[PDB]
Amino acid sequence: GLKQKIVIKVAMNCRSKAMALVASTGGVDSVALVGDLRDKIEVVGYGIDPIKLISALRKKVGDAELLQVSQAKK
Amino acid sequence: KQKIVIKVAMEGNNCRSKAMALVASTGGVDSVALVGDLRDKIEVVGYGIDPIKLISALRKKVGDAELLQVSQ
Amino acid sequence: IDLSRERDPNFFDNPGIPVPECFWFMFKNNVRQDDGTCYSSWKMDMKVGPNWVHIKSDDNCNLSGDFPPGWIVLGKKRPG
């Protein structure tokens, strides 16, 4: 199987709470604050359910929008 | 801009999730990544990170943690 | 639109997967909305305005996909 890349836009110290929450998700290899405004989370890992993660972000942090799903190439 | 790498005794009981969450929540952190084949080291990148505090927190809340690297 | 005069996407290369070879930039009416990195000779699903779009990249980071009117996603190689 291949690794996943997920980018989520989040309303955002919400940044620490969002990073903490995504970093705590099963199968996560990394989380990074990306974009000029540091308002995006890029997640890399395996077996991450993006619908489950957007739900957790909305219920814990605030408005969250799925922007990108893609696999790692090799 | 800092890069900090920490070896953590992460064995069993979703200690990885616990330690990633703890590091991810730290002041000044832009990115956190499990690194090495065994994903048994954490790479932290950001601004104004206190590596003493972070190591303390990890030994308190998770398991043994060793600074492998700090660079700027 | 001229990708020479758009500054670099704020990025983070996960060290456990290969380094993606392309920068991308998304515009609504020739205004930048969003940016990031992607692999050459690959694909990604992206939200572009109201629609999910399958974006294919070739080996030069040119991006094709059915973009809603007023929107485009353009791509270029990172140094090397």
Amino acid code (one letter) for C55: I
Q: Which chains would you list as touching A if contact means 3+ CB atom pairs under 8 Å?
A: B, C
Residue pair C41/C49 in contact by the 8 Å Cβ criterion:
no
The enclosing H or E element of C77 equals: strand C71-77
Q: Is C19 on the interface with A (CB under 8 A)?
A: no
- 3-class DSSP state of C79: coil
Give the Cα separation of B49 and B3 in Å (integer).
9
Residue of A38, A37, A34 lying closest to A68 (CA atoms): A34
Q: How far is B43 from chain C (nearest CA, A)?
A: 9
The enclosing H or E element of C27 equals: strand C22-28
Residue pair A63/B56 in contact by the 8 Å Cβ criterion:
no
Q: Are strands B41-46 and B2-8 parallel, antiparallel or unpaired?
A: antiparallel
Give the Cα separation of B44 and B27 in Å (integer).
11
Can you say how many angstroms the Cα of residue C71 is from the centroid of all Cα atoms in its chain? Answer: 12
Residues 6+ apart with CB under 8 A from C59: C40, C41
Residues of chain A with Cβ-Cβ distance to B29 below 8 Å are 16, 19
Q: What is the DSSP string of chain A?
A: ---EEEEEEE---HHHHHHHHHHTSTTEEEEEEESTTS-EEEEEESS--HHHHHHHHHHHTS-EEEEEEEEPP-
Token representation of residue C52? 């999910």
Residues of chain C with Cβ-Cβ distance to B45 below 8 Å are 12
Q: How far is A64 from chain C (nearest CA, A)?
A: 13
With CB atoms and an 8 Å threshold, state whether C15 touches B39: no
Method by which this entry was solved:
X-ray
Burial A23-37 (b: 16+ CB within 10 A, else e): bbbeebbbbbbbbee
Residue pair A32/C12 in contact by the 8 Å Cβ criterion:
yes
Q: Which of A20, A29, A33 sits opposite B34 (nearest CB)?
A: A29
The residue to which tokens 């990170």 are assigned:
B49
Question: In the beta sheet, which residues pair with residue C48?
Answer: C51
Task: Give the other-Cβ count within 10 Å of C74's Cβ.
Answer: 16
With CB atoms and an 8 Å threshold, state whether B25 touches A31: no
Residue pair B65/B56 in contact by the 8 Å Cβ criterion:
no
Burial C30-57 (b: 16+ CB within 10 A, else e): eeeebbbbbbbebbbebbbeeeebebeb
Q: ∠ at Cα A12 (C45, C75), nearest 5°? A: 30
* Residue C52 vs residues B66, C65, C75: alpha-carbon distances, Å: 44, 10, 18
* DSSP at B14: T
Token representation of residue B23? 């590091």
Residue pair C65/C52 in contact by the 8 Å Cβ criterion:
no
* DSSP at C7: P
Residue pair B27/B50 in contact by the 8 Å Cβ criterion:
yes
The residue to which tokens 């929107």 are assigned:
C71
Give the Cα separation of B31 and B43 in Å (integer).
8
Token representation of residue C38? 């992607």
Give the Cα separation of A42 and C42 in Å (integer).
18
Amino acid code (one letter) for A62: G
With CB atoms and an 8 Å threshold, state whether B32 touches A23: yes
Optimal mutation site among A14, A15, A30, interface B, most CBs of chain B within 10 A = A30
Token representation of residue B50? 């206190």
Give the Cα separation of A35 and B57 in Å (integer).
29
Can you say how many angstroms the Cα of residue B15 is from the centroid of all Cα atoms in its chain? Answer: 12
